[PDB]
Amino acid sequence: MLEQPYLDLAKKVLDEGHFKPDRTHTGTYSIFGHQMRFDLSKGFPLLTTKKVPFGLIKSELLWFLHGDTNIRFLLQHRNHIWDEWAFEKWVKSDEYHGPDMTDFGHRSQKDPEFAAVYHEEMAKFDDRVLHDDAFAAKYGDLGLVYGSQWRAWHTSKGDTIDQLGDVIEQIKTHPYSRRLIVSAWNPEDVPTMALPPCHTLYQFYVNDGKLSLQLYQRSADIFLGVPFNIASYALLTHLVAHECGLEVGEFIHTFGDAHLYVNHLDQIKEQLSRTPRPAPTLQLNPDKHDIFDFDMKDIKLLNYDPYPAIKAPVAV
Amino acid sequence: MLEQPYLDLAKKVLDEGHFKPDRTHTGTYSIFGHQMRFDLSKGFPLLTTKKVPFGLIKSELLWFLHGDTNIRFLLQHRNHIWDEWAFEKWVKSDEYHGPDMTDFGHRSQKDPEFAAVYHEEMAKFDDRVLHDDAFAAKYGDLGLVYGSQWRAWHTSKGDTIDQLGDVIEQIKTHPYSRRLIVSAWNPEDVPTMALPPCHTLYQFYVNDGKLSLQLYQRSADIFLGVPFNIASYALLTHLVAHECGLEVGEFIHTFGDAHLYVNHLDQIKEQLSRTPRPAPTLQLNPDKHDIFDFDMKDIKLLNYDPYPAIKAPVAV
Numbered sequence: 039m040l041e042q043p044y045l046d047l048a049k050k051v052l053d054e055g056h057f058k059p060d061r062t063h064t065g066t067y068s069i070f071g072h073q074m075r076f077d078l079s080k081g082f083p084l085l086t087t088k089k090v091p092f093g094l095i096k097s098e099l100l101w102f103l104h105g106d107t108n109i110r111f112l113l114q115h116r117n118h119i120w121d122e123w124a125f126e127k128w129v130k131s132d133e134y135h136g137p138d139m140t141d142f143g144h145r146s147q148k149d150p151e152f153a154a155v156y157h158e159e160m161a162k163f164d165d166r167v168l169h170d171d172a173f174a175a176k177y178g179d180l181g182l183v184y185g186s187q188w189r190a191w192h193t194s195k196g197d198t199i200d201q202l203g204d205v206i207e208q209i210k211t212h213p214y215s216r217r218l219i220v221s222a223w224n225p226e227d228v229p230t231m232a233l234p235p236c237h238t239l240y241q242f243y244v245n246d247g248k249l250s251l252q253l254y255q256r257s258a259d260i261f262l263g264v265p266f267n268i269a270s271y272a273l274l275t276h277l278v279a280h281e282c283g284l285e286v287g288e289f290i291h292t293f294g295d296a297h298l299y300v301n302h303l304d305q306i307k308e309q310l311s312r313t314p315r316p317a318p319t320l321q322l323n324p325d326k327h328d329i330f331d332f333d334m335k336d337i338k339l340l341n342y343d344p345y346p347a348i349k350a351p352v353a354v
Numbered sequence: 355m356l357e358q359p360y361l362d363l364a365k366k367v368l369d370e371g372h373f374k375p376d377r378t379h380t381g382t383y384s385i386f387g388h389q390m391r392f393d394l395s396k397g398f399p400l401l402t403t404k405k406v407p408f409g410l411i412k413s414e415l416l417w418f419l420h421g422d423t424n425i426r427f428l429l430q431h432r433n434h435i436w437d438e439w440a441f442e443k444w445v446k447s448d449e450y451h452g453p454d455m456t457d458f459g460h461r462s463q464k465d466p467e468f469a470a471v472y473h474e475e476m477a478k479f480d481d482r483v484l485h486d487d488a489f490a491a492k493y494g495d496l497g498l499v500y501g502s503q504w505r506a507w508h509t510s511k512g513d514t515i516d517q518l519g520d521v522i523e524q525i526k527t528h529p530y531s532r533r534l535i536v537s538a539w540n541p542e543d544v545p546t547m548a549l550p551p552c553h554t555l556y557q558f559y560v561n562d563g564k565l566s567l568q569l570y571q572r573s574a575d576i577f578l579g580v581p582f583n584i585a586s587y588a589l590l591t592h593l594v595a596h597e598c599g600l601e602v603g604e605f606i607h608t609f610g611d612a613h614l615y616v617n618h619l620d621q622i623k624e625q626l627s628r629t630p631r632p633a634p635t636l637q638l639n640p641d642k643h644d645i646f647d648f649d650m651k652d653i654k655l656l657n658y659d660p661y662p663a664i665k666a667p668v669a670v
């Protein structure tokens with residue numbers, strides 16, 4: 039079935055993965071160098087052996103296309119994927135006055151009550167973003183994130199570069215170009231960034247009318263991250279294809295370090311004993327063709343009938 | 355045998371490659387997304403089914419490690435891989451006074467005598483580089499090339515970044531880092547560069563003491579380029595391993611668009627009917643450990659007994 043390459047990866051890291059302790063106290067099983075190929079003509083590669091919330095994928099990708107870097111948009115969509123990154127800079131700024139919140143992520147699963155304190159503090163942070171415009175622009179804006187690096191790269195000569203925007207024109211006027219590349223890696227910011235881009239660099243390709251995209255992911259969290267990652271880029275390909283009036287081809291997922299956190303073993307194992315159902319389909323508004331102006335409603339996912347979700351502790 | 359992955363690629367592009375005309379008048383057969391794995395413990399991946407001049411690989415890589423961007427070094431080693439790029443800017447500069455030399459590369463194989471004129475003009479260009487220091491610094495320096503982008507990336511804040519140098523320290527003090535990355539792609543320079551980096555981005559990896567490197571090549575010339583490319587990076591891995599006192603592991607070669615120019619068909623086909631001999635070995639000076647100061651003599655290749663070279667026209 040379509041998603042087989044993902045399961046084959048999970049089974050692989052379990053069988054051939056060498057134990058590798060990492061940054062977080064939770065150890066991992068990792069491998070280096072892997073590639074998966076998904077034929078987008080067979081359907082949208084969203085996992086059926088587990089219920090991945092497609093909503094979040096949309097909410098985040100559109101955020102990216104809009105050159106947005108403010109968490110407000112996501113909170114305004116019930117998406118909370120980046121909250122912690124912004125909140126972190128809030129508890130450190132000499133303006134916040136409450137609990138210590140030192141590396142809260144870890145304490146949020148080892149000490150009861152504190153977690154409630156955390157979720158409580160987070161609620162006020164999030165609330166002040168959606169309503170207090172000044173607060174939103176101060177702590178809601180991440181600055182260095184996919185949205186800006188994709189569509190507002192900063193030059194040495196004080197200006198900005200619309201990478202994706204240009205590459206799209208390129209596909210349109212020079213489809214056979216082997217230079218259809220977009221990078222999120224900037225040597226200048228990387229030494230100090232909190233979380234350097236995992237989805238380091240991607241490339242487009244056009245052949246016989248079908249568009250394809252390869253993604254170089256320097257790091258991957260097989261159980262939690264990868265299921266989303268695949269969807270984001272499978273979607274991104276459709277979008278770029280929709281605008282360029284091209285048919286959709288393949289999505290090639292290349293990994294640097296693909297890993298599995300130890301406390302996800304039983305969950306992934308249980309997932310491996312699930313037979314995949316037929317892949318879903320994606321419906322993109324046939325009228326609207328300028329993806330940057332796209333909105334949630336302009337993307338539909340049909341026949342998605344996945345298995346129940348699998349609860350697993352986030353690694354910290 | 356060790357190099358099998360390369361031959362398997364050639365056979366693949368011939369069998370599954372879709373015809374794709376390109377920038378140059380010579381068409382190609384190309385594919386998108388491929389990965390080759392070489393176990394450096396079995397030997398240095400230099401082709402035995404064809405005689406690749408290892409000398410040039412050295413000459414160029416050391417040039418890179420030295421943060422050099424001046425062709426003089428290469429000419430001072432009989433290496434002429436980058437000559438044309440520098441020479442091109444010489445025939446355009448209002449100081450040169452001789453033949454037109456418009457896109458000489460193409461005319462150098464269609465019109466007799468002109469080729470002799472070209473090689474003649476080139477001789478004077480090269481000569482004036484090795485001897486006239488002022489000329490060397492003006493036209494011998496390429497500016498934007500692997501040497502500088504690896505070891506002298508320019509920031510927006512008017513300074514420079516020693517990417518490779520830092521990453522090496524990183525391997526030493528944080529080997530298990532999933533961020534051991536070096537990029538040659540800069541969104542600011544890419545829109546105007548003559549030849550944007552083919553070897554777009556690479557990543558290191560450490561596990562059980564063995565170092566490994568993955569290379570993302572957005573474009574590849576299977577017959578002419580790839581044989582060299584593999585060697586350069588297989589060597590680079592050994593060097594970084596030598597300094598970091600680590601053992602050598604694998605070299606993962608990932609491709610964006612891997613292609614084969616039509617006028618290389620018969621040559622590659624003839625190469626495919628050649629049985630590979632045992633792989634050679636690499637000897638790195640056991641005394642010297644700081645690779646940046648490495649010199650030609652510090653690298654040895656043993657048991658290299660390849661087949662005769664295969665002459666093939668360069669694509670233009």
Ligand SMILES: O=C1OC(c2ccc(O)c(Cl)c2)(c2ccc(O)c(Cl)c2)c2cccc3cccc1c23
Pocket residue numbers: 061062063122123126141142143144145232233354
């Ligand atoms: O790699 C990280 O992870 C952390 C992380 C991870 C996921 C996530 O969504 C968020 Cl916001 C934060 C993190 C968080 C809690 C911890 O207990 C530890 Cl050890 C590390 C993290 C928290 C704070 C600063 C950080 C700086 C660099 C790398 C991480 C990092």
Ligand SMILES: O=C1OC(c2ccc(O)c(Cl)c2)(c2ccc(O)c(Cl)c2)c2cccc3cccc1c23
Pocket residue numbers: 377378379438439442457458459460461548549670
């Ligand atoms: O992609 C290229 O290739 C060219 C090339 C290729 C290999 C090489 O070592 C050198 Cl220096 C130059 C080139 C050269 C001769 C030609 O007839 C044509 Cl069409 C194109 C080339 C020559 C001049 C300017 C160029 C600008 C962009 C891309 C190329 C390019």
